Amino acid sequence: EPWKRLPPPTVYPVKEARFEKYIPPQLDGRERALAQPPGQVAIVIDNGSHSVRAGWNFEDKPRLAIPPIMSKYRDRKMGKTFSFAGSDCYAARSHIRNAFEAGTGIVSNWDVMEHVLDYVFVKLGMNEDMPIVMTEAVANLPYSRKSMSEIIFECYGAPSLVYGIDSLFSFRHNQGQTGLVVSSSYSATHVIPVYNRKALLSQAIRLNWGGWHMAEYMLKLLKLKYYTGFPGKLNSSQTEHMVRDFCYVSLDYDRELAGYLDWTGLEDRERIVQYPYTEEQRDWSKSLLHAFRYGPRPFDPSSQAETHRVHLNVERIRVPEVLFQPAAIAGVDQAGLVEIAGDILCQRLPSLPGIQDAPDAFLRDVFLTGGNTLFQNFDERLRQGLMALLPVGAPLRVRRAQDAILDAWRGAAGWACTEEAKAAWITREEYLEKGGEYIKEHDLGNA
Amino acid sequence: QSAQAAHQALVEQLDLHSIHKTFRNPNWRPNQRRNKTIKAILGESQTNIESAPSLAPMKHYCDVTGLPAPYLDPKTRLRYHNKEIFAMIRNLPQGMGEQFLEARGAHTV
Ligand SMILES: Nc1ncnc2c1ncn2[C@@H]1O[C@H](COP(=O)(O)OP(=O)(O)OP(=O)(O)O)[C@@H](O)[C@H]1O
Ligand SMILES: [Mg+2]
Numbered sequence A: 001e002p003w004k005r006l007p008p009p010t011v012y013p014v015k016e017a018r019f020e021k022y023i024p025p026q027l028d029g030r031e032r033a034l035a036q037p038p039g040q041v042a043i044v045i046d047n048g049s050h051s052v053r054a055g056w057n058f059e060d061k062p063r064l065a066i067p068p069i070m071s072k073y074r075d076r077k078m079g080k081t082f083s084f085a086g087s088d089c090y091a092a093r094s095h096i097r098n099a100f101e102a103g104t105g106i107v108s109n110w111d112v113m114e115h116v117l118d119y120v121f122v123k124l125g126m127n128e129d130m131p132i133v134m135t136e137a138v139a140n141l142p143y144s145r146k147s148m149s150e151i152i153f154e155c156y157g158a159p160s161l162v163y164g165i166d167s168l169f170s171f172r173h174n175q176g177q178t179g180l181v182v183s184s185s186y187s188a189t190h191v192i193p194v195y196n197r198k199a200l201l202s203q204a205i206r207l208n209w210g211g212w213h214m215a216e217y218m219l220k221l222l223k224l225k226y227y228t229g230f231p232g233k234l235n236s237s238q239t240e241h242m243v244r245d246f247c248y249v250s251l252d253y254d255r256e257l258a259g260y261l262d263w264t265g266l267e268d269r270e271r272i273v274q275y276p277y278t279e280e281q282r283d284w285s286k287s288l289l290h291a292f293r294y295g296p297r298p299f300d301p302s303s304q305a306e307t308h309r310v311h312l313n314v315e316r317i318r319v320p321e322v323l324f325q326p327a328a329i330a331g332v333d334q335a336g337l338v339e340i341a342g343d344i345l346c347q348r349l350p351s352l353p354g355i356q357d358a359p360d361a362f363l364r365d366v367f368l369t370g371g372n373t374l375f376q377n378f379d380e381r382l383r384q385g386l387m388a389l390l391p392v393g394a395p396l397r398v399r400r401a402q403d404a405i406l407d408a409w410r411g412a413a414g415w416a417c418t419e420e421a422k423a424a425w426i427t428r429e430e431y432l433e434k435g436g437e438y439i440k441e442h443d444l445g446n447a
Numbered sequence B: 001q002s003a004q005a006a007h008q009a010l011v012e013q014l015d016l017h018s019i020h021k022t023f024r025n026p027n028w029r030p031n032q033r034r035n036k037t038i039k040a041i042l043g044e045s046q047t048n049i050e051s052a053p054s055l056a057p058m059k060h061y062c063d064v065t066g067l068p069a070p071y072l073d074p075k076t077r078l079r080y081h082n083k084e085i086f087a088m089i090r091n092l093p094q095g096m097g098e099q100f101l102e103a104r105g106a107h108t109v
Helices: A027-035 A110-123 A142-155 A166-173 A211-225 A236-246 A253-258 A288-294 A337-348 A378-387 A407-415 A428-434 B002-014 B038-045 B083-090 B096-102
Strands: A011-013 A043-047 A052-056 A064-066 A069-074 A081-084 A096-098 A132-136 A160-165 A179-184 A189-195 A272-274 A309-311 A366-369 A398-400
Touching: A027 A052, A043 A110, A043 A407, A052 A110, A052 A407, A064 A110, A069 A110, A110 A142, A132 A142, A132 A166, A132 A407, A142 A160, A142 A428, A142 B038, A160 A166, A166 A179, A166 A189, A166 A366, A166 A407, A179 A337, A189 A337, A211 A236, A211 A309, A211 B096, A288 A309, A288 B083, A337 A378, A366 A378, A378 A398
Parallel strands: A011 A272, A043 A132, A132 A160, A179 A366, A366 A398
Antiparallel strands: A043 A052, A052 A064, A069 A081, A069 A096, A179 A189, A272 A309
16 A cells, blocks of 8 residues: 555656767858957857867857867777767767866866867867967966967967956856855866955865766765666766756755655655666565665566666755765865855955955855756755854845856856957967966956 | 668768868977876975865764764764664675775775
8 A cells, every 4th residue: 555556656767978969160150250350259168177168259159068078099990090079979989088187177188188179179160360268277277277378379379368267257247246156067166255356266265076076976875875786887977967857955954854765755755767678574665775775666676677777865965965064975074165155254354454345245146156056955055054154134145147057158258358358368479488377367367 | 781881970970080180280299298187286386275174063974875873883884874774784795884984985994
């Protein structure tokens, strides 16, 4: 009865990163880039560790959104070498390398990056001569900046280059004026105070947790849950789609958690992911570990359909909460997001001598940027966490960016050719004298 | 067979190596040592001083089920929810106990 009353389970197929289509080079964009007025055209590249986004500053969306990966091998029976540099890596050999150091925002495999840039300029239709706007990590390492700008000037010969922070471009695109910028991305999570459109990067803080770490942690958990052996090949690309589709932030974690595996209504809290298959008086119904692994239904190892499926359960909410409880849930040994934001608003900014109307100036706009903020209740959870730390009735608002993935590129595109930007451009002839570490300090860039 | 031919057609269609890059300077060639890890870069540089620890007391969760854990097992040092998970933990294969620690970055040694 307790299970026979239940309907047949709703089960979701696995999703994974895959090749979808050929994209021919967009030569129409190259023609427009020549027709548009002088000094008002640039190539805008957002170096997302999850997605390199590239396109024309005069256009409202990027032409490319491509993983920073390459593949290079010989079909030894065929002798010719093949090379791939984006979703043309079928992420069918999957002989792949990535430009970034895994779990960081910093480019580290420059041969991969150079092949990714080669792909970008081919697909934008380069027939070479065009200014480049390129996003950076916050506090991006000098050696990394030197190596990237060397590639831009020595290899590709571009006339000018400017470096700015993706979260700050996103803030500008959303009428940001003063505020606390909270970004969660693939690489990391940052809180940046912005005063009078200028970021106070000396008061920025990084969490070292992000969408990459969530997919990796979700994979560790699923491997442990099914340590007896899950017969499907668990991959981090699959758990990345699981974190997107099913995880959410809990409004009251311990209250929700402690009842999560309770047997009544577990078929609602549980969501079931089907891996592909081929087919020709104490007991389980009072065991917690059956609920954890297999939910309200009875289980049999005979069914190829009922093996080859993972039951998510507590990791639906346990995985996002590493942002809020990092040392408890994943041993990260860093302050949680609410404690970081609270430290900035309450301890740092009121002490800072040049600032006025702190916290209330910043507190009136806590701004959320980057894809890894898109969890359900992320904003309300951050609001209610800060509300307890602030003086009573303080004018706290938390706000989401529009389209919090692409909006960082749209900001750099809108900014790209303004007089503020063109005062920040470095020319090739400056680079040849100043070197690649030198930059024009500006409100959207590093010091 | 057409499936192999189509796959080889796609592989050739997608390859970048078959494509000449007129926009690429042939004379510049990179230093073969240029790929360096963050530790190497920081060690050679010796602002990535943006991380921060926390002083508040952390909550305790079960290493197996993630539910709250009243108990720390003195033998295997896994945190566990109840006696059922304590039984599971003590029955684990000899390698598995270190994996539950390592999922939260802990290790037994
Ligand atoms: N709707 C969504 N809900 C939750 N997470 C999402 C959603 N859409 C995308 N993500 C995740 O957001 C992450 C992408 O983050 P983002 O695009 O801000 O990073 P990035 O700019 O590529 O990287 P970085 O700035 O760290 O180098 C991925 O882990 C992706 O799985
Ligand atoms: Mg980003």
